Amino acid sequence: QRRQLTPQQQQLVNQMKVAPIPKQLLQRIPNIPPNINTWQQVTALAQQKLLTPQDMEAAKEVYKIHQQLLFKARLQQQQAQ
Amino acid sequence: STDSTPMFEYENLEDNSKEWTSLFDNDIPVTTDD
What are the start and end residues of every segment in region (Required for transcriptional activation) (chain B)? Predict the structure, then answer.
Protein backbone atom coordinates (compact mmCIF):
# COMPACT_ATOMS: atom_id res chain seq x y z
CA GLN A 1 0.00 0.00 0.00
CA ARG A 2 0.94 3.68 0.15
CA ARG A 3 3.52 4.74 2.73
CA GLN A 4 5.40 8.04 2.73
CA LEU A 5 8.14 8.71 5.28
CA THR A 6 10.90 11.27 4.89
CA PRO A 7 13.87 10.64 7.28
CA GLN A 8 14.02 14.33 8.21
CA GLN A 9 10.29 14.71 8.89
CA GLN A 10 9.74 11.29 10.45
CA GLN A 11 12.28 12.01 13.17
CA LEU A 12 10.50 15.22 14.14
CA VAL A 13 6.84 14.19 13.91
CA ASN A 14 7.21 10.64 15.26
CA GLN A 15 9.11 11.94 18.29
CA MET A 16 6.37 14.50 19.05
CA LYS A 17 4.35 11.56 20.36
CA VAL A 18 6.44 11.31 23.49
CA ALA A 19 7.39 14.87 24.26
CA PRO A 20 6.72 16.71 27.54
CA ILE A 21 5.97 20.44 27.52
CA PRO A 22 8.92 22.36 29.07
CA LYS A 23 8.47 24.86 31.90
CA GLN A 24 9.25 27.65 29.44
CA LEU A 25 6.14 26.69 27.49
CA LEU A 26 4.00 25.70 30.50
CA GLN A 27 3.82 29.39 31.38
CA ARG A 28 1.73 29.92 28.24
CA ILE A 29 -0.94 27.50 29.45
CA PRO A 30 -1.41 27.76 33.25
CA ASN A 31 -3.81 25.93 35.58
CA ILE A 32 -3.75 22.58 33.80
CA PRO A 33 -6.01 19.87 35.37
CA PRO A 34 -3.90 16.81 34.25
CA ASN A 35 -0.71 18.52 35.47
CA ILE A 36 1.11 16.14 33.14
CA ASN A 37 3.69 17.43 30.67
CA THR A 38 3.67 14.58 28.13
CA TRP A 39 1.67 15.46 25.02
CA GLN A 40 0.00 12.06 24.90
CA GLN A 41 -1.59 12.81 28.27
CA VAL A 42 -2.01 16.54 27.54
CA THR A 43 -4.05 15.97 24.36
CA ALA A 44 -6.75 14.56 26.63
CA LEU A 45 -7.62 18.16 27.52
CA ALA A 46 -9.11 18.63 24.07
CA GLN A 47 -10.58 15.12 24.01
CA GLN A 48 -12.37 15.68 27.33
CA LYS A 49 -13.77 18.90 25.83
CA LEU A 50 -12.18 20.85 28.68
CA LEU A 51 -10.16 22.99 26.29
CA THR A 52 -12.25 26.01 25.35
CA PRO A 53 -11.87 27.97 22.06
CA GLN A 54 -9.85 30.52 24.03
CA ASP A 55 -7.44 27.79 25.16
CA MET A 56 -7.22 26.39 21.65
CA GLU A 57 -5.56 29.52 20.29
CA ALA A 58 -3.02 29.30 23.11
CA ALA A 59 -2.23 25.61 22.61
CA LYS A 60 -1.39 26.31 18.98
CA GLU A 61 1.60 28.42 19.99
CA VAL A 62 2.74 25.90 22.58
CA TYR A 63 2.87 23.02 20.09
CA LYS A 64 4.61 25.17 17.47
CA ILE A 65 7.23 26.57 19.87
CA HIS A 66 7.84 23.08 21.25
CA GLN A 67 8.56 21.74 17.75
CA GLN A 68 11.13 24.50 17.25
CA LEU A 69 12.77 24.00 20.65
CA LEU A 70 13.11 20.26 20.00
CA PHE A 71 15.20 20.98 16.91
CA LYS A 72 17.68 23.15 18.81
CA ALA A 73 17.78 20.74 21.75
CA ARG A 74 18.90 18.01 19.35
CA LEU A 75 21.75 20.08 17.91
CA GLN A 76 22.96 21.68 21.18
CA GLN A 77 25.01 24.87 20.98
CA GLN A 78 26.77 24.11 24.26
CA GLN A 79 28.75 20.88 24.47
CA ALA A 80 30.22 19.87 27.81
CA GLN A 81 31.64 16.68 26.35
CA SER B 1 33.57 37.26 11.61
CA THR B 2 31.31 34.25 12.16
CA ASP B 3 30.25 33.06 8.71
CA SER B 4 27.02 31.10 8.41
CA THR B 5 24.36 30.51 5.76
CA PRO B 6 20.82 31.59 6.82
CA MET B 7 19.42 29.62 3.89
CA PHE B 8 18.78 26.00 4.79
CA GLU B 9 17.58 22.91 2.93
CA TYR B 10 15.10 20.80 4.92
CA GLU B 11 14.43 23.61 7.38
CA ASN B 12 11.74 25.13 5.16
CA LEU B 13 8.30 26.39 6.19
CA GLU B 14 5.87 23.71 5.04
CA ASP B 15 2.11 24.22 4.79
CA ASN B 16 1.36 20.74 6.17
CA SER B 17 0.31 22.10 9.58
CA LYS B 18 -3.01 20.19 9.32
CA GLU B 19 -1.45 17.10 10.93
CA TRP B 20 -0.65 19.18 14.01
CA THR B 21 -4.07 20.77 14.43
CA SER B 22 -5.96 17.50 13.91
CA LEU B 23 -4.37 16.21 17.12
CA PHE B 24 -6.88 18.36 18.99
CA ASP B 25 -9.60 16.10 17.60
CA ASN B 26 -7.97 12.73 16.96
CA ASP B 27 -5.16 11.22 19.02
CA ILE B 28 -4.20 7.71 17.94
CA PRO B 29 -5.12 6.69 14.36
CA VAL B 30 -6.93 3.38 13.88
CA THR B 31 -5.13 2.77 10.60
CA THR B 32 -2.05 3.95 8.71
CA ASP B 33 -3.25 4.21 5.11
CA ASP B 34 -1.00 7.17 4.40
Answer: 6-25
CB pairs under 8 A between A and B: 26
- Say if the Cβ atoms of B24 and A64 lie within 8 Å: no
Query: Domain segments of chain A: what residues?
Result: 1-81
Experimental method: NMR
3-state secondary structure chain A: CCCCCCHHHHHHHCHHHCCECCHHHHCCCCCCCCCCCEHHHHCHHHHCCCCCHHHHHHHHHHHHHHHHHHHHHHHCCCCCC
The phi, psi pair for A78, rounded to 5°, reads -115, 115
Q: Is B15 helix (H, G, I), strand (E, B) or coil?
A: coil
| Interchain pair B34, A56: CB under 8 A | no
User: Which positions in chain A touch B32 (Cβ < 8 Å)?
Assistant: 3
CATH 1.10.287.2920 fits A1-81, yes or no: yes
